[PDB]
């Protein structure tokens, strides 16, 4: 009936999907034509968001759900079996996301109980979890990774390893893997008057002016900005407000165009003008 989230594969070859019928379908789009390939069923409740891991680790795809469980489906010659499953949270799991391929193969999941698990991949079928309890007050909805940014020897840089995240408390808390090992909330961002729906960490076009977008029940979309590296300054700026809720927000890769999904079943595109004010470039559909 109604799908929730569906994301294209890297190298634009597949297209995983999931709807409230608890079915994770993986289609294939060669030439523009859709063609199913498997219907991974396994959630006691509707699937929420879904994300493809980086081809560098073979072919992986994870899906979270209202069943409080998250699944990771590997692939071995057409063998779409699940190599691992995680049920560490007590309430539904609104979102998942993968850490930039350099950190390794880390997966972030925000539940509705107000927590956040972080599955890290080891040598074999072993997955150690780094959980953060009471991250948001009433639960969490969004989880986005901060772009992998590199900091006299041939080493593999220790990254800042940050990742934002909105929730039901209206706060968009940023996070940072402390040198020791655990994550701490580097900062809070309270600009929304109701539930934060989604939070997307725009990719850095090599540019240091890292941005982040958010949309919430109030029907406003903010593009929080940081003027420089290392200054704990996030100054929100209003994109627009619709009389209805905004459900999703995503960043287009090159221009940094924002796809604003929400309001009237309509989706909008925005590009920040040479003036600083954001505009609607067109209406989709």
């Amino acid at each position: 009936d109604m799908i929730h989230d569906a994301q294209m594969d890297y190298y634009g070859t597949r297209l995983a999907t999931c709807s409230s019928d608890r079915s994770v379908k993986i289609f294939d789009v060669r030439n523009g034509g859709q063609i199913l390939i498997a219907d991974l069923r396994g959630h006691e409740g509707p699937v929420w968001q879904v994300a493809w891991a980086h081809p560098m680790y073979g072919n992986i795809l994870a899906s979270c759900s209202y069943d409080r469980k998250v699944i990771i489906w590997r692939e071995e010659n057409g063998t779409w079996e699940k190599s691992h499953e995680h049920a560490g949270h007590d309430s539904s799991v609104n979102s998942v996301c993968w850490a930039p391929h350099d950190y390794g193969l880390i997966l972030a999941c925000g539940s509705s109980d107000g927590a956040i698990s972080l599955l890290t991949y080891t040598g074999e079928g072993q997955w150690e979890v780094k959980k953060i309890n009471n991250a948001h007050t009433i639960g969490c909805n969004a989880v986005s990774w901060a772009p992998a940014v590199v900091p006299p020897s041939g080493q593999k840089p220790n990254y800042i390893k940050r990742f934002a995240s909105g929730g039901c408390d209206n706060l968009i808390k940023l996070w940072k893997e402390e040198e020791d090992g655990q994550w701490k909330e580097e900062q809070k961002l309270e600009a929304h008057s109701d539930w934060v729906r989604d939070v997307a960490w725009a990719p850095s076009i090599g540019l240091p002016t890292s941005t982040i977008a958010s949309c919430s029940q109030d029907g406003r979309v903010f593009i929080w900005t940081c003027d420089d590296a290392s200054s704990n300054t996030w100054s929100p700026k209003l994109l627009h407000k619709f009389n209805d809720v905004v459900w999703h927000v995503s960043w287009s890769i090159t221009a940094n165009i924002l796809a604003v999904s929400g309001g009237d079943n309509k989706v909008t595109l925005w590009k920040e003008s040479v003036d600083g004010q954001w505009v609607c470039i067109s209406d989709v559909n």
Binding site: E128, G154, Q155, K156, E177, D180, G181, Q182
Partner: protein, 400 residues
């Protein structure tokens, strides 16, 4: 006056001609250590870089002395005879004496622990454990299992204090500060946690195990069960990130949350520990020391060689392994020391870029031959030759 450093190393040589061999390396350790201090205490930020390099040199000599003393000094002592009745503890002892290869790994581990960073002891420690939760009454049962048993009762504040405790005990364990660890555990008020630590020792009975007759019997007879229980415990989530790490170490397994900040030495440490833990148990199993009942869970039976240890560690921590002196450390551990010496010499015909490295190889070769006629004569001359030339550039012809 730091320039006079050359004097100290060479200075040792002077005394050596007059005297004995081993102390020379020992002094090399002391000397570089002293130098580490001077550049360290007060200085241009540039010195810090040079400083650490000296510290590393100090460590390298220490490791150097330790390994050779064992290898060379080794005078074959009597064998040990065990019997089936003897305890596991005796068997382990025997394994260590007999297997020089494994013991050497131990020597390295001791070394790694010796140079381990420890945080300063937790300051305003809470008078009692989980006081907050008790205060805010919610704790039906005080025991540590209560939260494992059920959901959300612990207070945030309590969970935070545990995070400091378990992080500190952990660093202590890596250090090898087991006794202090126990001390903290007792005083902290965590008797239970303390008990698990006690599990470390194997069972020895002075009565039956005559060879090391102590006074009381000590250790736990069902070590395998203890080991697995700890292992199983470590896996169980809802535990501290540093708590699960400690059990992992005890189990002889690896961790992830903590090893994110795991450095080369630390990572080297954790991995070797696995090798040892596995090695002992296999030996015990061959001896039929273990009982079938104990084998509750599966464990990773295979053990990598030391060579693989470095190689794999080398892949994750390529910076510290690519270090000039660090490669030497590994080199010594493998034992193929001479190989690099000749190898390195060929680089001289970017060694030149590091100042210390050229000096290092030289004193090292000189030391080797004295303890054991070793390195090639050709290499010695080429090295000494290049080094002497530096002495003139330095304008300290006097000592040449």
């Amino acid at each position: 006056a730091s320039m006079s450093m050359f004097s100290d190393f060479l200075q040792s040589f002077l005394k050596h001609s007059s005297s004995t061999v081993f102390d020379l390396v020992e002094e090399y350790e002391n000397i570089c250590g002293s130098q580490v201090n001077i550049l360290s205490k007060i200085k241009f930020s540039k010195t810090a870089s040079m400083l650490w390099l000296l510290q590393q040199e100090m460590v390298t000599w220490r490791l150097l002395a330790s390994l050779y003393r064992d290898r060379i000094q080794s005078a074959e002592e009597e064998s040990v005879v065990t019997a089936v009745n003897a305890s596991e503890k005796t068997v382990v002892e025997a394994l260590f004496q007999r297997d020089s290869l494994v013991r050497q790994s131990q020597l390295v581990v001791d070394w790694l622990e010796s140079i381990a960073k420890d945080e300063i002891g937790i300051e305003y420690a809470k008078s009692v454990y989980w006081e907050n939760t008790l205060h805010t009454p919610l704790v039906t049962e005080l025991d540590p299992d209560a939260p494992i048993r059920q959901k959300m009762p612990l207070d945030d504040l309590d969970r935070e204090d545990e995070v400091r405790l378990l992080k500190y005990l952990f660093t202590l364990i890596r250090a090898g500060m087991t006794e202090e660890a126990q001390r903290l555990c007792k005083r902290c008020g965590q008797a239970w946690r303390a008990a698990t630590l006690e599990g470390w020792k194997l069972y020895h009975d002075p009565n039956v195990n005559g060879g090391t007759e102590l006074e009381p019997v000590e250790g736990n007879p069902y070590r395998r069960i203890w080991k697995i229980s700890c292992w199983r415990m470590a896996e169980d989530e809802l535990f501290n990130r540093y708590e699960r790490a400690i059990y992992a170490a005890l189990s002889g397994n690896l961790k992830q949350l903590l090893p994110v900040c795991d450095t080369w030495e630390d990572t080297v440490w954790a991995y070797f520990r696995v090798m040892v833990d596995s090695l002992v148990e296999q030996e015990i199993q061959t001896s039929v020391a273990t009982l079938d009942e104990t084998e509750e869970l599966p464990r990773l039976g295979a053990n990598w060689t030391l060579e693989k240890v470095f190689e794999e560690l080398q892949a994750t921590d390529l910076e510290e392994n690519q270090e000039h002196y660090h490669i030497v450390q590994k080199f010594l551990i493998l034992g193929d020391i001479d190989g690099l010496m000749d190898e390195f010499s060929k680089w001289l015909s970017r060694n030149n870029l590091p100042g210390h490295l050229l000096r290092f190889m030289t004193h090292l070769i000189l030391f080797f031959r004295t303890l054991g006629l070793q390195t090639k004569e050709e290499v010695s001359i080429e090295v000494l030759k290049t080094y002497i030339q530096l002495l003139i550039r330095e304008k300290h012809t006097n000592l040449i």
